[PDB]
């Protein structure tokens, strides 16, 4: 069961602008407990290479290593939506349990790998499809054209239904799911903007802690560093946006829509039963075309209506972007 | 919500040896519904390369490429204990939710990152710390040496509990945790040599789809392939085992010992609460020392017994 919120994680990355030997750490707990400690999701190698005290000579080579590595920490990323979350249950009293019996979970939106750290995303709750309803099939004893008409209208309304549900799903995906993803977009840029300012204030300390002659005999410039980090960040944000787009579309296509389709297929099946029962109960009235109708019903209600994203998006620009990731 | 077992995931990776061309798949569920499909955690690019219809001419190069690839898929494996598992709540009714209030989970032992899949591990449950509340404080009437005795005994008994609980935790971490982790090593290596069996089955199906004078012109020995990826498999197990070792030792150091330390401090607290009430029910009988006792009490019961790994290993 749940215990922390994101605040836990985010506070760990925060610091106030108050000068001290502030260092990057790989422990959320340690960051949260020492105000001169800041949590990084970068590799320990980068941590050891940033917390390090460095003589004024090798100082400008230190910085250059960092900026390459920083770029290499924020841009070298990987992704997948293939994740096995395995919980192993240790019997402390009994005999050992069979690995078959251990717990397995793979229902994840996707995962962003940073060499130093893995970011996983899951979404809840599953979308709620409004109840689809039951077509009232009106009988007209001894009236072929009119009973045929209720069959035909039943099948048309059914198609409309697939359209309504799809439309419903897309509008919520745009209005509720993508809006949340956008806030994640913003938080990830922010996390990065903040990791840049951590590494920055760690350096500015070292250089604003040197013999005033070295401070002039070392060409140094904040805007120089405070730019090679932003372009580094924007470069990194290209992959992150790509990932988040992939998550958005994957969620629409592999979670939301299939859930809606399952519903519409049930609807189809019980409408199919109703219509076949209807046909049998009017088979006198409908003589000459019972088999035609029986088949038109079966064929129709056994072929799914494919989902066409382009029906429901009138931005085109948005359409172009999302279509890539299918 | 529902919990599921590893069973199906393991089954997904299984195939019967026949004569049909099995195909690797990145879909667990597709493999489970199809005898001809076997789940793999290698890159999708591996899946594509192995599932490829290959001509007799290009055969050997394709096998050799796969061996290299197989070695990269299994050796070029990264690891970490830094995982941020974030559940995003979607508000279907109302305004957007601040990311700050989404859920955050990070109690994993470690993560094994292959080119085509991430494997997260977590261990449950906490170890039961044996009942510490064992002794009661006997009220001796007007016997100062013997009330001071019970108090010195209680204090000397907690030092004993701390030790015994450390020993108990390390004991159960060798006999129970390290045992279950050694079954992880087993099922992992065994999975790797099922991926090796899969790929061999696929490559051997391809060799045995050619003409007889063609197969004669191709220096292919199914045995030297077997050795070649066993080499790769044993190679992979170095970093897998280093991982599990780091896993094993982190759980001891980061979960078990800290838990025991908490339940132990709970004990210490409860013991003062009862030692002082014992002093208030032993009014004055101890005076001339009341200070001296409470000081050595608080010196002792407000300070954890340092845990030293070397001692218990």
Numbering used by the authors:
A (entry chain B): 545 to 870
B (entry chain A): 545 to 857
What does the paper say about this structure?
Botulinum neurotoxins (BoNTs), the most poisonous biological toxins for mammals, are speculated to exploit a similar mechanism to block neurotransmitter release at neuromuscular junctions that results in fatal botulism. A BoNT molecule consists of a light chain (LC) and a heavy chain (HC) that are linked by a disulfide bridge. LC is a zinc-dependent endopeptidase that is delivered into the cytosol where it degrades SNARE proteins to inhibit synaptic vesicle exocytosis. Membrane translocation of LC is mediated by HC, which can be subdivided into a translocation domain (HN) and a receptor-binding domain (HC).
